[PDB]
Amino acid sequence: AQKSFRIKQKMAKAKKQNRPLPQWIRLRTNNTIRYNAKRRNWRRTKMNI
Amino acid sequence: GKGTPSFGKRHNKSHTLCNRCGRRSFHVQKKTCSSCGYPAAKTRSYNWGAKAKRRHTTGTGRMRYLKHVSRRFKNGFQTGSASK
Amino acid sequence: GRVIRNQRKGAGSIFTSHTRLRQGAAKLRTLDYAERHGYIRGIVKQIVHDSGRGAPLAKVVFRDPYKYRLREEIFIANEGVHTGQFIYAGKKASLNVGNVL
Amino acid sequence: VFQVSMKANKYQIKKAVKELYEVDVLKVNTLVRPNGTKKAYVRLTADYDALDIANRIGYI
Amino acid sequence: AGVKAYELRTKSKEQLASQLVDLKKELAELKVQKLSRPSLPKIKTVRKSIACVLTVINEQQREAVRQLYKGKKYQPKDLRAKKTRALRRALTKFEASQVTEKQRKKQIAFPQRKYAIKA
RNA sequence: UUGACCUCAAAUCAGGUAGGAGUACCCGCUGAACUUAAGCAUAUCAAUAAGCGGAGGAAAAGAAACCAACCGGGAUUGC
RNA sequence: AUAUUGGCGAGAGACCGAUAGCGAACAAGUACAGUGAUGGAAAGAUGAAAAGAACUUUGAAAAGAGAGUGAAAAAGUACGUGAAAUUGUUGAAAGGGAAGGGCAUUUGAUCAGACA
RNA sequence: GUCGAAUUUGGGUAUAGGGGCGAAAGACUAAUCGAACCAUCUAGUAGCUGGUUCCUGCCGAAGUUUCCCUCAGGAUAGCAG
RNA sequence: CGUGGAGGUCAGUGACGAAGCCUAGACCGUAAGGUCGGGUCGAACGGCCUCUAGUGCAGAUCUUGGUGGUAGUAGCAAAUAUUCAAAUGAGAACUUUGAAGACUGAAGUGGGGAAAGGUUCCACGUCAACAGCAGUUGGACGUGGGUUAGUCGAUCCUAAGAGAUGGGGAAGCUCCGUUUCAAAGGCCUGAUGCAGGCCACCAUCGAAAGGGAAUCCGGUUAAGAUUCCGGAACCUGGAUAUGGAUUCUUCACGGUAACGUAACUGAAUGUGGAGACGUCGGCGCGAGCCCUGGGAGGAGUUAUCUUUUCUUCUUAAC
RNA sequence: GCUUGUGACGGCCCGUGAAAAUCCACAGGAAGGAAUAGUUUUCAUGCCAGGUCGUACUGAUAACCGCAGCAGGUCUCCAAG
RNA sequence: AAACUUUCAACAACGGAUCUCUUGGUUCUCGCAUCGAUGAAGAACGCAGCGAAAUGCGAUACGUAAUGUGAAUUGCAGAAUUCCGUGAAUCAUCGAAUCUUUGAACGCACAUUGCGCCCCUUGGUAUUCCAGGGGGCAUGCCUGUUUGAGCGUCAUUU
Ligand SMILES: CN[C@@H]1[C@@H](O)[C@@H](O[C@@H]2[C@@H](O)[C@H](O[C@H]3O[C@H]([C@@H](C)O)[C@@H](O)[C@H](O)[C@H]3N)[C@@H](N)C[C@H]2N)OC[C@]1(C)O
Ligand SMILES: CN[C@@H]1[C@@H](O)[C@@H](O[C@@H]2[C@@H](O)[C@H](O[C@H]3O[C@H]([C@@H](C)O)[C@@H](O)[C@H](O)[C@H]3N)[C@@H](N)C[C@H]2N)OC[C@]1(C)O
Ligand SMILES: [Mg+2]
Ligand SMILES: [Mg+2]
Ligand SMILES: [Mg+2]
Ligand SMILES: [Mg+2]
Ligand SMILES: [Mg+2]
Ligand SMILES: [Mg+2]
Ligand SMILES: [Mg+2]
Ligand SMILES: [Mg+2]
Ligand SMILES: [Mg+2]
Ligand SMILES: [Mg+2]
Ligand SMILES: [Mg+2]
Ligand SMILES: [Mg+2]
Ligand SMILES: [Mg+2]
Ligand SMILES: [Mg+2]
Ligand SMILES: [Mg+2]
Ligand SMILES: [Mg+2]
Ligand SMILES: [Mg+2]
Ligand SMILES: [Mg+2]
Ligand SMILES: [Mg+2]
Ligand SMILES: [Mg+2]
Ligand SMILES: [Mg+2]
Ligand SMILES: [Mg+2]
Ligand SMILES: [Mg+2]
Ligand SMILES: [Mg+2]
Ligand SMILES: [Mg+2]
Ligand SMILES: [Mg+2]
Ligand SMILES: [Mg+2]
Ligand SMILES: [Mg+2]
Ligand SMILES: [Mg+2]
Ligand SMILES: [Mg+2]
Ligand SMILES: [Mg+2]
Ligand SMILES: [Mg+2]
Ligand SMILES: [Mg+2]
Ligand SMILES: [Mg+2]
Ligand SMILES: [Mg+2]
Ligand SMILES: [Mg+2]
Ligand SMILES: [Mg+2]
Ligand SMILES: [Mg+2]
Ligand SMILES: [Mg+2]
Ligand SMILES: [Mg+2]
Ligand SMILES: [Mg+2]
Ligand SMILES: [Mg+2]
Ligand SMILES: [Mg+2]
Ligand SMILES: [Mg+2]
Ligand SMILES: [Mg+2]
Ligand SMILES: [Mg+2]
Ligand SMILES: [Mg+2]
Ligand SMILES: [Mg+2]
Ligand SMILES: [Mg+2]
Ligand SMILES: [Mg+2]
Ligand SMILES: [Mg+2]
Ligand SMILES: [Mg+2]
Ligand SMILES: [Mg+2]
Ligand SMILES: [Mg+2]
Ligand SMILES: [Mg+2]
Ligand SMILES: [Mg+2]
Ligand SMILES: [Mg+2]
Ligand SMILES: [Mg+2]
Ligand SMILES: [Mg+2]
Ligand SMILES: [Mg+2]
Ligand SMILES: [Mg+2]
Ligand SMILES: [Mg+2]
Ligand SMILES: [Mg+2]
Ligand SMILES: [Mg+2]
Ligand SMILES: [Mg+2]
Ligand SMILES: [Mg+2]
Ligand SMILES: [Mg+2]
Ligand SMILES: [Mg+2]
Ligand SMILES: [Mg+2]
Ligand SMILES: [Mg+2]
Ligand SMILES: [Mg+2]
Ligand SMILES: [Mg+2]
Ligand SMILES: [Mg+2]
Ligand SMILES: [Mg+2]
Ligand SMILES: [Mg+2]
Ligand SMILES: [Mg+2]
Ligand SMILES: [Mg+2]
Ligand SMILES: [Mg+2]
Ligand SMILES: [Mg+2]
Ligand SMILES: [Mg+2]
Ligand SMILES: [Mg+2]
Ligand SMILES: [Mg+2]
Ligand SMILES: [Mg+2]
Ligand SMILES: [Mg+2]
Ligand SMILES: [Mg+2]
Ligand SMILES: [Mg+2]
Ligand SMILES: [Mg+2]
Ligand SMILES: [Mg+2]
Ligand SMILES: [Mg+2]
Ligand SMILES: [Mg+2]
Ligand SMILES: [Mg+2]
Ligand SMILES: [Mg+2]
Ligand SMILES: [Mg+2]
Ligand SMILES: [Mg+2]
Ligand SMILES: [Mg+2]
Ligand SMILES: [Mg+2]
Ligand SMILES: [Mg+2]
Ligand SMILES: [Mg+2]
Ligand SMILES: [Mg+2]
Ligand SMILES: [Mg+2]
Ligand SMILES: [Mg+2]
Ligand SMILES: [Mg+2]
Ligand SMILES: [Mg+2]
Ligand SMILES: [Mg+2]
Ligand SMILES: [Mg+2]
Ligand SMILES: [Mg+2]
Ligand SMILES: [Mg+2]
Ligand SMILES: [Mg+2]
Ligand SMILES: [Mg+2]
Ligand SMILES: [Mg+2]
Ligand SMILES: [Mg+2]
Ligand SMILES: [Mg+2]
Ligand SMILES: [Mg+2]
Ligand SMILES: [Mg+2]
Ligand SMILES: [Mg+2]
Ligand SMILES: [Mg+2]
Ligand SMILES: [Mg+2]
Ligand SMILES: [Mg+2]
Ligand SMILES: [Zn+2]
């Protein structure tokens, strides 16, 4: 409901990072990334506040 | 049910977000945090905890100032600038 | 063995006294020039019930001797003291229920 | 409607709208966007037309 | 293109102030286009320009105050040399070499004498 | 009445300095038990682990209130 | 002169060779568990080079079939080699309450040698 | 069973391990309680149980003696190489 | 006999194919093992004389990984329940719409919140994985969009409680003490230090359910609204002027009184009142709801009956 | 009638049922005040200003915790015939 | 006789053994002496034309200045980009800066982006109320300065 800013800010950095790889990353040279490893989802890994 | 039906009551965070180290170790009712001991002056550490130590000591951070101090020492701690 | 009840009382965690509804510490007036030479009146304004005392309290107001204002004292109301009784305190006071000497 | 530094209040904002855009600000209500930006709804005095003040700053 | 550094050192200060406002007006326009456009790389050169103005501005006012305090005790700290806090304490060469009267006399009396042997 | 002395204070006074970090090595405080004893309490593990304080490029130690009993030796450290 | 499982900078080894070697050779003190102190992984190798399979064709697609690239698709981003358990199909054989073994020959299959 | 009170309950706040808390069951103290949990001392000790990785050749045992807080173990002589 | 590595040798084998793997093919040894052919393969490797060790596995309820039989098996049976047609789509028992049968029955399967979550909300795109059948649907995937306040909360105040400070203990990490054996600080006036009078409470944190300054209705969005749009308010803090009132009895009259009012100087210093309060019982009364007559409109039933059944008829803060 | 507010009372207690920040009043009589005009921001009207953080939705037989779209656990307001 | 079951083979599965690699680990030795109030270690939150991370940086934000080299950067897009040149570049180098919110963290707090105070300046008609902008107030202690306190105490006024 009515949340601390500190929380509503970390919430934002959260949402901001929930995204698939930028597909252009794959094309780079000597690029070893494939998918987004660290991807989270609300119902699976809760953030611990 | 010392089990599940009485885990259904866990809504109240024992700690919140520590300011100094960010660890969600900051004990509400105790107003101190269980990792670095903020607000204590020194930062909390022990020798049985070498894995904790290794986790938090210098070099897990940005080393913002300290990084270049080996360079700066290399040069004799120079002032002014190079000419051409 | 464990620590018995009667030892556990003494660092006073859940044992300390239930202090909330309490009218404040009952006391006489301080021992001053007015009581140890002359006498000094007061009025019992209010007698009122203390929580966790069986003994009613008398709220008795005096006149500050050294500045202009009223000062309230919390008196343990002896049987018969009533609302609006004058109360006299000091070496030279008289002998009547409720005066102090 | 403008994205606006979090570090600005309704004051420094209405100050920067008058200056940079030459317009008169009826009222400002700011909120903060789920991604950590501050959006501003800046209402112009009826003396101005926002549609017209808009494509003068060049977006449409 | 844009904003060489050596080129803003010869200019004076009031116009660097008014040249910046141009970069700022500029930058603020580019930002209104970059949301009309897929690509807007020019926007880099201008914002990195704004940095080079502000470099020289502050570079200037700084070497300004450095002279108007020069040659005296007590000039503000950030113009003092950084060295290290352990070098910043560090008995000075003057109060290092300082010798006692009685010792100065002995040095002079008998300092170390270069000699040698011959087999 | 005025001028000192002494002690004790107050300034966002003038300039300074201490705090945390790291800790392999170092100077101190504090301080076990597992263990060995085929049991176990002195003892051992050990003047060790854990805890606390404080340094440096090394620390510390050091020009003898030393060692010796010799025809004497001669600050300290280390092998 | 002595000390040095820390810091910075260097040369090396009859050391380890991705279940080894520091827990981490990888976005590793990561992901993740936990109220918390703490705990704490898995995971390297297409090829010289993407030349990463145009184009046709069946399919709603995924794909399949052709074609094509390449020294190699018995290298197709499930990619070097590709073992074993275990599994599909083809071939062969045998089997009246297990299977397997030893000696010996018949039969089927299959082979070396020798001679000239 | 109780259900208008020694009632139910939210949130805040106090007590921390030989300690707390207990209308008392050794109950409760984060699925942990006749002493929580975390790490380190710590590869704790074991006369006890389990295992202990190639081949062949020759030799080839003992369960008895004496002492032992010894009786599932040692020392000791005897057998064996 | 075999393995990893080292010194020496064979100017040893190799991209014209090293090493490894596969092979009821061939050979040597009692054996540990060694050799060969064929297949697969790609970049190194072996004999001999010595050196060295993290050197040989079937087991340790062994460690890590990998895989079977069980086995298309146990199972996918609480919470009354589904049906017909069409639309869409490659595909419909399961998605949409239409019709039907039902349920939760206002102590809800409705309408909102507190803790907690943290984008789930909403749109479009979408079906590899997930939704222990299905999936064209989703709380899934992908790209976006979205949360507007002087008045709603927070901020302020205090509660149990927590906790700086002169201090007192403790080798120390730190323990103790919040009035605490203290030289503790302000505030209003003026005549900017000055003249003054004071008042001297010595921190602070601790309530999104306690206290408390103040907003209502209508409309609006895909998603926000007591926040936005329209009108209509109130408060708090600053500024000042015009009217009004008051005075030649200077700081208002009237009313016996209780009281009146459009107003109708006020420094401290004091005092008083709201802040400010249990619980239950019955009685009164208000507000919303319930029921219901007349009538003005819409809806249903009408073989038969019913001046009938249903429903609109409203009024915010100020 | 139902709900909810509220009043005036009554029962109850060895239980008698918070505190602070605020707002007002009163006592009070410092001081300042008219007649050629003076006092009056608690009567009316009129001007400027009100920042900052939160505000979506769920609130549960799928949005929380129970390893999960778990027959469990988890505070409350509204309530028709 | 099939089916089925077993056993061997080839192809195909399943799985990741072997072998060969090796920007890593390990140990040995050699040399060096540098964190912090001049805000350190660490923390949160940000920065890119197009990034979720690693690495890097701080509202001048994969970076600014300065010096060296001498033409690249590259995944695409992009450059009055400018190549016999104060000049490409994610280059090296680093001597000058920036350096958000913090943190021993210092005005007071901090489950709050919560609440003061003082100085300069600007704007609202303003010493005073509101706002914008720059600049400031922690503690212990030493040296010194200025102002003070006490019949602690010494002189000196008539
Ligand atoms: C190859 N696999 C084996 C194959 O060896 C053979 O097995 C025979 C077996 O049938 C013979 O036969 C025997 O075993 C069978 C069996 C069904 O138990 C019995 O029914 C029978 O009584 C008995 N005589 C036995 N004596 C020797 C094996 N080699 O038969 C087929 C199989 C059992 O699958
Ligand atoms: C020389 N010895 C005495 C010394 O014994 C001590 O005495 C204290 C005295 O100061 C206290 O007294 C003081 O402190 C107390 C405190 C406890 O709150 C206060 O209540 C009291 O009013 C106050 N005067 C007294 N109440 C206790 C004595 N032992 O301190 C005072 C002293 C004169 O220095
Ligand atoms: Mg590579
Ligand atoms: Mg490559
Ligand atoms: Mg979980
Ligand atoms: Mg959790
Ligand atoms: Mg949380
Ligand atoms: Mg609970
Ligand atoms: Mg708690
Ligand atoms: Mg965590
Ligand atoms: Mg550890
Ligand atoms: Mg130099
Ligand atoms: Mg008490
Ligand atoms: Mg807002
Ligand atoms: Mg806001
Ligand atoms: Mg300075
Ligand atoms: Mg140092
Ligand atoms: Mg000073
Ligand atoms: Mg220190
Ligand atoms: Mg001791
Ligand atoms: Mg041991
Ligand atoms: Mg023993
Ligand atoms: Mg023993
Ligand atoms: Mg120690
Ligand atoms: Mg040395
Ligand atoms: Mg020394
Ligand atoms: Mg001497
Ligand atoms: Mg000697
Ligand atoms: Mg090194
Ligand atoms: Mg490994
Ligand atoms: Mg590992
Ligand atoms: Mg658990
Ligand atoms: Mg390789
Ligand atoms: Mg490669
Ligand atoms: Mg094909
Ligand atoms: Mg090949
Ligand atoms: Mg081919
Ligand atoms: Mg193969
Ligand atoms: Mg290949
Ligand atoms: Mg495979
Ligand atoms: Mg392959
Ligand atoms: Mg096989
Ligand atoms: Mg049978
Ligand atoms: Mg048998
Ligand atoms: Mg059978
Ligand atoms: Mg047989
Ligand atoms: Mg009843
Ligand atoms: Mg409770
Ligand atoms: Mg409750
Ligand atoms: Mg709580
Ligand atoms: Mg005990
Ligand atoms: Mg105790
Ligand atoms: Mg339990
Ligand atoms: Mg035994
Ligand atoms: Mg036995
Ligand atoms: Mg080895
Ligand atoms: Mg075989
Ligand atoms: Mg071959
Ligand atoms: Mg081969
Ligand atoms: Mg090769
Ligand atoms: Mg071994
Ligand atoms: Mg093996
Ligand atoms: Mg095995
Ligand atoms: Mg064996
Ligand atoms: Mg199984
Ligand atoms: Mg299976
Ligand atoms: Mg099946
Ligand atoms: Mg079936
Ligand atoms: Mg079945
Ligand atoms: Mg069942
Ligand atoms: Mg159709
Ligand atoms: Mg159909
Ligand atoms: Mg269905
Ligand atoms: Mg029903
Ligand atoms: Mg709702
Ligand atoms: Mg809701
Ligand atoms: Mg959709
Ligand atoms: Mg399914
Ligand atoms: Mg499916
Ligand atoms: Mg939805
Ligand atoms: Mg989505
Ligand atoms: Mg507000
Ligand atoms: Mg408060
Ligand atoms: Mg304290
Ligand atoms: Mg103190
Ligand atoms: Mg103290
Ligand atoms: Mg409240
Ligand atoms: Mg309101
Ligand atoms: Mg909107
Ligand atoms: Mg809505
Ligand atoms: Mg009148
Ligand atoms: Mg109350
Ligand atoms: Mg009819
Ligand atoms: Mg109202
Ligand atoms: Mg009553
Ligand atoms: Mg007032
Ligand atoms: Mg008043
Ligand atoms: Mg006077
Ligand atoms: Mg909302
Ligand atoms: Mg809402
Ligand atoms: Mg909601
Ligand atoms: Mg609900
Ligand atoms: Mg509900
Ligand atoms: Mg869950
Ligand atoms: Mg047959
Ligand atoms: Mg195969
Ligand atoms: Mg490599
Ligand atoms: Mg900084
Ligand atoms: Mg990068
Ligand atoms: Mg250059
Ligand atoms: Mg560089
Ligand atoms: Mg260089
Ligand atoms: Mg800057
Ligand atoms: Mg602070
Ligand atoms: Mg905020
Ligand atoms: Mg905050
Ligand atoms: Mg002004
Ligand atoms: Mg102000
Ligand atoms: Mg200071
Ligand atoms: Mg200081
Ligand atoms: Zn912390």
Tab-separated table of N, CA, C and O (backbone and C1' of nucleotides) in Angstrom, chain C residues 1-5 7-9 12-15, chain H residues 14-15 18-22 24 26-28 35:
chain	number	residue	atom	x	y	z
C	1	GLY	N	20.619	-26.868	37.465
C	1	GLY	CA	19.243	-26.428	37.345
C	1	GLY	C	19.036	-25.062	36.718
C	1	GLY	O	19.964	-24.267	36.539
C	2	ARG	N	17.764	-24.783	36.451
C	2	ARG	CA	17.270	-23.569	35.806
C	2	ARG	C	17.367	-22.409	36.805
C	2	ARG	O	18.095	-22.520	37.800
C	3	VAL	N	16.735	-21.267	36.517
C	3	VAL	CA	16.615	-20.168	37.473
C	3	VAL	C	15.174	-20.106	37.973
C	3	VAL	O	14.231	-19.961	37.181
C	4	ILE	N	15.014	-20.210	39.295
C	4	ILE	CA	13.686	-20.286	39.885
C	4	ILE	C	12.971	-18.962	39.718
C	4	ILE	O	13.584	-17.911	39.499
C	5	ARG	N	11.648	-19.017	39.886
C	5	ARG	CA	10.806	-17.828	39.857
C	5	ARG	C	11.403	-16.700	40.679
C	5	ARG	O	11.657	-15.614	40.156
C	7	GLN	N	14.296	-15.900	41.779
C	7	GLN	CA	15.485	-15.209	41.284
C	7	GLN	C	15.138	-14.353	40.074
C	7	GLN	O	15.576	-13.200	39.973
C	8	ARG	N	14.325	-14.913	39.164
C	8	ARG	CA	13.945	-14.254	37.917
C	8	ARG	C	13.177	-12.965	38.151
C	8	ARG	O	13.007	-12.183	37.209
C	9	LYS	N	12.682	-12.733	39.370
C	9	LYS	CA	11.910	-11.523	39.598
C	9	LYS	C	12.799	-10.294	39.563
C	9	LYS	O	12.334	-9.217	39.177
C	12	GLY	N	13.827	-7.743	36.896
C	12	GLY	CA	12.603	-7.006	36.687
C	12	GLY	C	12.206	-6.864	35.241
C	12	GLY	O	12.138	-5.743	34.733
C	13	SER	N	12.001	-7.959	34.525
C	13	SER	CA	11.484	-7.703	33.196
C	13	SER	C	9.974	-7.632	33.295
C	13	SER	O	9.430	-6.553	33.504
C	14	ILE	N	9.280	-8.758	33.328
C	14	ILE	CA	7.830	-8.649	33.221
C	14	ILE	C	7.266	-8.418	34.616
C	14	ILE	O	6.047	-8.414	34.831
C	15	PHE	N	8.173	-8.277	35.574
C	15	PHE	CA	7.778	-8.141	36.967
C	15	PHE	C	7.620	-6.708	37.467
C	15	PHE	O	6.903	-6.499	38.456
H	14	A	P	11.703	-2.882	22.837
H	14	A	O5'	11.362	-3.622	24.221
H	14	A	C5'	11.897	-3.192	25.473
H	14	A	C4'	11.600	-4.152	26.625
H	14	A	C3'	12.369	-5.458	26.659
H	14	A	O3'	13.633	-5.292	27.246
H	14	A	C1'	10.081	-5.846	27.157
H	15	U	P	14.860	-6.064	26.596
H	15	U	O5'	14.793	-7.510	27.269
H	15	U	C5'	14.798	-7.660	28.689
H	15	U	C4'	14.400	-9.054	29.149
H	15	U	C3'	15.153	-10.187	28.485
H	15	U	O3'	16.320	-10.513	29.223
H	15	U	C1'	12.811	-10.627	28.495
H	18	G	P	24.658	-20.449	28.070
H	18	G	O5'	24.138	-19.957	29.487
H	18	G	C5'	24.491	-20.633	30.692
H	18	G	C4'	23.361	-20.589	31.698
H	18	G	C3'	23.741	-21.014	33.096
H	18	G	O3'	22.817	-20.444	34.020
H	18	G	C1'	22.375	-22.684	32.067
H	19	G	P	22.914	-18.893	34.410
H	19	G	O5'	22.179	-18.148	33.217
H	19	G	C5'	20.794	-18.339	33.023
H	19	G	C4'	20.260	-17.450	31.942
H	19	G	C3'	18.777	-17.185	32.017
H	19	G	O3'	18.436	-16.198	32.951
H	19	G	C1'	19.372	-17.687	29.788
H	20	G	P	16.984	-16.273	33.603
H	20	G	O5'	15.977	-15.963	32.412
H	20	G	C5'	15.846	-14.669	31.857
H	20	G	C4'	14.987	-14.728	30.625
H	20	G	C3'	13.495	-14.885	30.876
H	20	G	O3'	12.857	-13.639	31.098
H	20	G	C1'	14.219	-16.418	29.196
H	21	C	P	11.912	-13.460	32.371
H	21	C	O5'	10.704	-14.459	32.053
H	21	C	C5'	9.746	-14.088	31.072
H	21	C	C4'	9.074	-15.253	30.378
H	21	C	C3'	8.187	-16.134	31.221
H	21	C	O3'	6.951	-15.560	31.543
H	21	C	C1'	9.506	-17.493	29.856
H	22	G	P	6.384	-15.875	33.002
H	22	G	O5'	5.956	-17.416	32.942
H	22	G	C5'	4.725	-17.806	32.336
H	22	G	C4'	4.542	-19.309	32.222
H	22	G	C3'	4.241	-20.066	33.501
H	22	G	O3'	2.856	-20.071	33.794
H	22	G	C1'	5.991	-21.127	32.359
H	24	A	P	0.593	-24.233	33.714
H	24	A	O5'	1.802	-25.179	34.082
H	24	A	C5'	1.945	-26.447	33.463
H	24	A	C4'	2.850	-27.339	34.263
H	24	A	C3'	2.191	-27.804	35.541
H	24	A	O3'	2.779	-29.033	35.942
H	24	A	C1'	3.948	-26.308	36.061
H	26	G	P	6.220	-32.996	33.641
H	26	G	O5'	7.413	-32.235	32.904
H	26	G	C5'	7.820	-32.629	31.605
H	26	G	C4'	8.519	-31.546	30.829
H	26	G	C3'	9.560	-32.084	29.860
H	26	G	O3'	9.073	-32.422	28.556
H	26	G	C1'	10.508	-30.348	31.192
H	27	A	P	7.535	-32.771	28.200
H	27	A	O5'	6.805	-31.365	28.297
H	27	A	C5'	7.209	-30.339	27.410
H	27	A	C4'	6.293	-29.142	27.411
H	27	A	C3'	6.665	-28.059	26.405
H	27	A	O3'	6.213	-28.351	25.087
H	27	A	C1'	6.258	-27.075	28.518
H	28	C	P	7.134	-27.985	23.823
H	28	C	O5'	7.150	-26.392	23.818
H	28	C	C5'	5.962	-25.625	23.616
H	28	C	C4'	6.260	-24.145	23.691
H	28	C	C3'	7.607	-23.731	23.097
H	28	C	O3'	7.661	-23.606	21.683
H	28	C	C1'	7.422	-22.810	25.249
H	35	A	P	19.165	-31.501	27.444
H	35	A	O5'	19.138	-29.927	27.156
H	35	A	C5'	18.248	-29.367	26.182
H	35	A	C4'	18.526	-27.903	25.873
H	35	A	C3'	19.936	-27.567	25.382
H	35	A	O3'	19.888	-26.423	24.539
H	35	A	C1'	19.526	-26.469	27.423
